């Protein structure tokens, strides 16, 4: 189906403990494929997926340069942001950036992204038109005016419509064994007595790729949204994900409850019941 490529970047200042730490990772869909950490012994962009290992030394040289340059501009940006918010130089602050593109099954661009956050809060974002900006406050309006004067959006649009889509296409082909394989969830229901009067029914989805999934409980065919405990989808460590949804069920009611599972690896949604 559709696919995405994203690059994530975090700089965190640490006054009195050296210069800010810079960490960036790249993903295609839910697969990590490159990383770079300024605190590494000899910082370089490193591969994290087999299908990117085949890029030659020119790639790794260029990528490493880009990462180092971004570490440097972020340190200047952190100094800038202290002035914009009238802040002391005493404290730790955080600068985050994400950009990338989504394509449809035909490889064409569905939308691009480029957006920043300071201290955990939205700061400035490129709008879906790839030509105008949403600034969160009057400080980000100062950045907005500078980026409008410099025609930054035009530079980002050219990347997002061109190189971004073209790299994602190359990666999807070179990594077609995995990037284009959906692993369906392995599912079962467990039963956990709480007292004489009620027990937990837990519906499991294990070993699935990609991470997107829907897990729901119904009672007599009605959604139990407010009475379901739904854990956050979590990484297994083997590229796959896990999730469960649990409801508290009065004694003797178990067969009135059904668990419903949707996943792109499933050709039809599943319905499951507790099987004693």
Contact footprint for other proteins (CB under 8 A): 7-8, 10, 12, 23, 25-26, 32, 35, 37, 59, 62-63, 66-67, 69-70, 73, 76-77, 80-81, 84, 91-92, 94, 96, 98-99, 116-117, 119-124, 143, 146-147, 152, 155-156, 159, 163-164, 167, 190, 192, 202, 206, 231-232, 234-238, 242, 244
- Smallest distance from the beta carbon of 80 to other proteins, in angstroms? 5
Phi/psi of residue 264, each to 5°?
Answer: -65, -20
Pairing of strands 46-47, 222-223: unpaired
Under 8 Å between Cβ of 93 and 87: yes
- Smallest distance from the beta carbon of 15 to other proteins, in angstroms? 13
- Smallest distance from the beta carbon of 185 to other proteins, in angstroms? 14
Of 146 and 181, the one with the shorter C-beta distance to other proteins is 146
- Smallest distance from the beta carbon of 217 to other proteins, in angstroms? 16
Give, in order, the Cα–Cα distances in Å from 165 to each of 3, 136, 182, 245, 250.
10, 28, 21, 36, 52
Of 127 and 269, the one with the shorter C-beta distance to other proteins is 127
Of 164 and 215, the one with the shorter C-beta distance to other proteins is 164
- Smallest distance from the beta carbon of 143 to other proteins, in angstroms? 4
Give, in order, the Cα–Cα distances in Å from 260 to each of 106, 191, 241.
30, 16, 17
Phi/psi of residue 104, each to 5°?
Answer: -90, -175
Of 29 and 116, the one with the shorter C-beta distance to other proteins is 116
- Smallest distance from the beta carbon of 123 to other proteins, in angstroms? 8
Of 115 and 224, the one with the shorter C-beta distance to other proteins is 115
Of 67 and 222, the one with the shorter C-beta distance to other proteins is 67
CA 75 – CA 79 distance, rounded (Å): 7
């Amino acid at each position: 189906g559709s696919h995405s490529m994203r690059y994530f970047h975090t700089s965190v200042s640490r006054p009195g403990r050296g210069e800010p730490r810079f960490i960036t990772v790249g993903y295609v869909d839910d697969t990590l494929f490159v990383r770079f950490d300024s605190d590494a012994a000899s910082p370089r962009e490193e591969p994290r997926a087999p299908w990117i290992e085949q890029e030659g030394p020119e790639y790794w040289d260029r990528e490493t340069q880009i990462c180092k340059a971004k570490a440097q501009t972020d340190r200047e940006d952190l100094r800038t942001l202290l002035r914009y918010y009238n802040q002391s130089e005493a404290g730790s602050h955080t600068l985050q950036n994400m950009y990338g593109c989504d394509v449809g099954p035909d490889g064409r661009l569905l939308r691009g992204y480029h957006q920043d956050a300071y201290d955990g809060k939205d700061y400035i974002a490129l709008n879906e038109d790839l030509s105008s900006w949403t600034a969160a406050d009057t400080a980000a309006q100062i950045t907005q005016r500078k980026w409008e004067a410099a025609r930054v959006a035009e530079q980002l649009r050219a990347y997002l419509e061109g190189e971004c889509v073209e790299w994602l296409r190359r990666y999807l082909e070179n990594g077609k064994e995995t990037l284009q394989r959906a692993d369906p969830p392995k599912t079962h229901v467990t039963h956990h007595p709480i007292s004489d009067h009620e027990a937990t029914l837990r519906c499991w989805a294990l070993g699935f790729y990609p991470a997107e999934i829907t897990l729901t409980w119904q009672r007599d065919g009605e959604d139990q949204t407010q009475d379901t405990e739904l854990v956050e989808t979590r990484p297994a460590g083997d590229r796959t994900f896990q999730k469960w949804a649990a409801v508290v069920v009065p004694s003797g009611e178990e067969q009135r409850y059904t668990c419903h599972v949707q996943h792109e690896g499933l050709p039809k949604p599943l319905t499951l019941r507790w099987e004693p």
